[PDB]
Amino acid sequence: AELTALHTLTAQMKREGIRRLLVLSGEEGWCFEHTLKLRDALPGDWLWISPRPQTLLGREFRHAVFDARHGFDAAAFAALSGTLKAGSWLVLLLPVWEEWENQPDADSLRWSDCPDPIATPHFVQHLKRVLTADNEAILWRQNQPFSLAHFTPRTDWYPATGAPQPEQQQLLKQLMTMPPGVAAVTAARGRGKSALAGQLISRIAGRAIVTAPAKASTDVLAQFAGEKFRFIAPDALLASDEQADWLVVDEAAAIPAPLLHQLVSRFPRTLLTTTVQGYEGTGRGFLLKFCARFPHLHRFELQQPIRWAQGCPLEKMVSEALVFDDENFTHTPQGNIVISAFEQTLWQSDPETPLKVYQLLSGAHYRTSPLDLRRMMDAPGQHFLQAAGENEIAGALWLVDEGGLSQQLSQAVWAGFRRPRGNLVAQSLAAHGNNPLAATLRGRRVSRIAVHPARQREGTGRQLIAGALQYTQDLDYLSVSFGYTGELWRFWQRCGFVLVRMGNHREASSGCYTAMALLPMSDAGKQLAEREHYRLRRDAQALAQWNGETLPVDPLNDAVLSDDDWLELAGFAFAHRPLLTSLGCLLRLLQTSELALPALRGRLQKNASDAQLCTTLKLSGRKMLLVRQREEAAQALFALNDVRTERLRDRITQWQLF
Ligand SMILES: CC(=O)SCCNC(=O)CCNC(=O)[C@H](O)C(C)(C)COP(=O)(O)OP(=O)(O)OC[C@H]1O[C@@H](n2cnc3c(N)ncnc32)[C@H](O)[C@@H]1OP(=O)(O)O
Numbered sequence: 001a002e003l004t005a006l007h008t009l010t011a012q013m014k015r016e017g018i019r020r021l022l023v024l025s026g027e028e029g030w031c032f033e034h035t036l037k038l039r040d041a042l043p044g045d046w047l048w049i050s051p052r053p054q055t056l057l058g059r060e061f062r063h064a065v066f067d068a069r070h071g072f073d074a075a076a077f078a079a080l081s082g083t084l085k086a087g088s089w090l091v092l093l094l095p096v097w098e099e100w101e102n103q104p105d106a107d108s109l110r111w112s113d114c115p116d117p118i119a120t121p122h123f124v125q126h127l128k129r130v131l132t133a134d135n136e137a138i139l140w141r142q143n144q145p146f147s148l149a150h151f152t153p154r155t156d157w158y159p160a161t162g163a164p165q166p167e168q169q170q171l172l173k174q175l176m177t178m179p180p181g182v183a184a185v186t187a188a189r190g191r192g193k194s195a196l197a198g199q200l201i202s203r204i205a206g207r208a209i210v211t212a213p214a215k216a217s218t219d220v221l222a223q224f225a226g227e228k229f230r231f232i233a234p235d236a237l238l239a240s241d242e243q244a245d246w247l248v249v250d251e252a253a254a255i256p257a258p259l260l261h262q263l264v265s266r267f268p269r270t271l272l273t274t275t276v277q278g279y280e281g282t283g284r285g286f287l288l289k290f291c292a293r294f295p296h297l298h299r300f301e302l303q304q305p306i307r308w309a310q311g312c313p314l315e316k317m318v319s320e321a322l323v324f325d326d327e328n329f330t331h332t333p334q335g336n337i338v339i340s341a342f343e344q345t346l347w348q349s350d351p352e353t354p355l356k357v358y359q360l361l362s363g364a365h366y367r368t369s370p371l372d373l374r375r376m377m378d379a380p381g382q383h384f385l386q387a388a389g390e391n392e393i394a395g396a397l398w399l400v401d402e403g404g405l406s407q408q409l410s411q412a413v414w415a416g417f418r419r420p421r422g423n424l425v426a427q428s429l430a431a432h433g434n435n436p437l438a439a440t441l442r443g444r445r446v447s448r449i450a451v452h453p454a455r456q457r458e459g460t461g462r463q464l465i466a467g468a469l470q471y472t473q474d475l476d477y478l479s480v481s482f483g484y485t486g487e488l489w490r491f492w493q494r495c496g497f498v499l500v501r502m503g504n505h506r507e508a509s510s511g512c513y514t515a516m517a518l519l520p521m522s523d524a525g526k527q528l529a530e531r532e533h534y535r536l537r538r539d540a541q542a543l544a545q546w547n548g549e550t551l552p553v554d555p556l557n558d559a560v561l562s563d564d565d566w567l568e569l570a571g572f573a574f575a576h577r578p579l580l581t582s583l584g585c586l587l588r589l590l591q592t593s594e595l596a597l598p599a600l601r602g603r604l605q606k607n608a609s610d611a612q613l614c615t616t617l618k619l620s621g622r623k624m625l626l627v628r629q630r631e632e633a634a635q636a637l638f639a640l641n642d643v644r645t646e647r648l649r650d651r652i653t654q655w656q657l658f
């Protein structure tokens, strides 16, 4: 009856070149029996995808089941959908419809920073609205009437052979006739960007070098490039002297801009591709700023999906359910900007405002992912501020609660004896700062801040921050962790932030060291910030030398061990403070100490590598090298002042909980 009509609709769907969503909501057993009946009725691959701690290689599947009876992994869901052949069904399993909203989500663990699964009602609420706003999705609920609807047909659709499709062929012509320069092809996932690049390398008379951040499937690109495919990771290409007629970079947005701008000037012609939004995509707002960095950039777009018809209701559902649409970056917010704050409860009563805020926040980031949406919707401790124009959002601020850790735990974190999650900056203040009680303080971290690109540099970004200060109290500080650049820091400095830390680990994506800053609000917060800033000024010279980048603070070259220094050195010597976190102090210890300290001196003063040190000192590896460095620090301290060292060791030793 129902299966027979379902078999007929499938032929139509396959003929129309679309995919569709079939929801099975009911008891687990009931749901499963229906997947059994559905597969033998509609033969196909029926890939099953379910949750726990890939096949999206170039694989395509006919029909699939997504098991969300106990957890909903949004990214996986989105990834699966874009892998289904035309005529495919996406069979989504969900818990009893009336119990869906309050049922814990096993997946929530990956993004809630909670110890146990939490319900995610706002997300479910949103899903139900998309799900029942039209009839495109087939909703099959247990003990509820079921009647396959009848859809007005759409034109016959035909798959791609291998020859470039119309939009590709046209882009291919402009690419092959443009004078020397840079071209960027932007588009939603599945529009044939990687194939276009391969088709290009395949058809030019000259050589071409391709590069990419991680080698994101470069497979499709290689397939169309054929024997002419030549890949070189970004950093090894900058270092090499290799040349080519064309430089082809897909997912160029995920590559550090300074490296990219340098690589491009080496090649007469460059093709940049980047997928916009969706799972693991990049924000449209971010893209605007990215392209702006290439003068005389030729921007091109691709709109037609290649493995399904433009209009597929499955793609529309996923885009709506996960908020991948970004048309707002097209319109310019008008008039006076008005700042206001709101809480996560607004999802339930007025979802359009947090929806629009997410659009802007998501569109301004270099990476887009439904993990963020899940977090904003149901994780606890999230708070928002918005900057509204007459009929559109001009800016938004996303804050998250942090700190309030017990004295005992903070100390444990400081010593590095314990490192649980959540409280990113709070814990970092302790683990990388001088105050073992830094994590007991309360504040809110700036998770994301974004201003519409047509409304930047008018003060809305600073007014957003002013609003956060305005609408909240009983907080020790506002904090922010960001990839460092002089421009971005200057913005935070304006907003009143105080730099308290500069990392030593360049972010793979941005290529920047991570900086941390604080906008203090209580006398305790003010002291943490000044104290930490003073410490950074004493470590500036050592940091700049190690990082290869000067820090923007007045350096204090006073090499004299302080009480502050002794505490940290003891933490390094008798606990688990990281070597680099103790860089400034260790260097000051080494300047005063008369001891050989080969492991510390070799690494910090003579540019020896870990491998070389291990061989010269005959250690088994990095682990023992570090243990030896801690023992050397202890010796140096004892050789300077035995009793002070013993008291410090005794004190920090006890901070180990359990
Ligand atoms: C994790 C964290 O969220 S990290 C940081 C990331 N978010 C951003 O990547 C998105 C990209 N950028 C934007 O959307 C922006 O340019 C924002 C957040 C960084 C700033 O907002 P804007 O509205 O342009 O800020 P605003 O105009 O209020 O800047 C105000 C103060 O900062 C200065 N400033 C602002 N932008 C910049 C910039 N790009 N370079 C240098 N200085 C700047 C100011 O002019 C002003 O001080 P002033 O009174 O002397 O003029």
Ligand SMILES: Nc1ncnc2c1ncn2[C@@H]1O[C@H](COP(=O)(O)OP(=O)(O)O)[C@@H](O)[C@H]1O
Residues within 6 Å of the ligand: 058, 160, 161, 162, 163, 164, 165, 168, 187, 188, 189, 190, 191, 192, 193, 194, 195, 196, 220, 221, 275, 306, 307
């Ligand atoms: N002209 C074409 N002919 C045949 N298959 C194609 C063609 N263009 C793209 N494809 C295939 O369709 C899909 C789109 O891949 P892709 O080009 O990498 O789009 P995107 O870069 O936006 O993710 C892949 O499975 C690819 O192999």
